[PDB]
């Protein structure tokens, strides 16, 4: 008899508040926890 249970409940909710450049760092969430450097500088300028 072999029994196995797997559960990976990983979630997030970034709060990024430039109107247009909001989407970038917030949607970069897939498999990229750390935000891009150049994208962060662009959002800072925006």
């Amino acid at each position: 008899a072999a029994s196995g249970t797997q559960n990976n409940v990983l979630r997030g909710e970034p709060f990024i508040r430039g109107a247009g450049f909001i989407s970038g760092l917030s949607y970069l969430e897939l498999d990229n926890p750390a935000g891009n450097k150049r994208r962060y500088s662009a959002w800072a300028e925006s």
């Binding site: 008899a1 072999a2 029994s3 196995g4 249970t5 797997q6 559960n7 990976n8 409940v9 990983l10 979630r11 997030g12 909710e13 970034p14 709060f15 990024i16 508040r17 430039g18 109107a19 909001i22 917030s26 949607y27 969430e29």
Partner: protein, 49 residues
């Protein structure tokens, strides 16, 4: 005069104020779950007389 993104705009007579606001919040909730189950039963019997 009205300025939005280095562009000169016009405010009509009926609109009180139209100001771009940042107001950004996104949520991303991912779920992962797996379940395994296995069963095996060997049975053998022999009799000789």
């Amino acid at each position: 005069p009205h300025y939005i993104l280095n562009t000169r705009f016009r405010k009509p007579y009926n609109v009180e104020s139209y100001t771009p606001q940042t107001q950004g919040k996104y949520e991303f909730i991912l779920k992962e779950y797996e379940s395994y189950s296995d069963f095996e039963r060997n049975v053998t019997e022999k009799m000789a007389s």
